[PDB]
């Protein structure tokens, strides 16, 4: 692997929960930020613009506390028009958090409930 990431607690989760999300080895990244997405039909990468944190490295770590609410207002491009509240329950795919520096690395890590 390119980088380990790794999330605990992870399953069970309700409302009002809060997780703590983590990362260790760096080498082609130089900053790092925590966004999640609701997949749909289409396909358009529908993300909340509030829930965002970006802060560089302290030497090559970088921990977060993210909130999981059960439906917020999505955001589709700089462009819009904005779609509104949507369930992330309802979807195909459905909520996953994506952690990954500006140059092009990803490592994706689905969530489940109770």
Do not use: K, W
């Amino acid at each position: 692997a390119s980088a380990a990431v790794s999330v605990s607690p992870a399953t069970g989760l309700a409302d009002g929960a809060t997780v703590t999300v983590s990362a260790s080895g760096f080498a082609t990244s130089t900053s790092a930020t925590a966004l999640q997405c609701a997949i749909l039909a289409d396909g358009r990468g529908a993300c909340n613009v509030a829930e965002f944190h970006d802060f560089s490295l302290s030497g090559g770590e970088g921990t977060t506390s993210v909130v999981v609410r059960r439906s917020f207002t999505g955001y589709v491009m700089p462009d819009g028009p904005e779609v509104g509240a949507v369930d992330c329950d309802t979807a195909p795919g459905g909520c996953e958090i994506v952690v990954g520096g500006n140059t092009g690395e990803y490592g994706n890590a689905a969530i489940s409930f109770g």
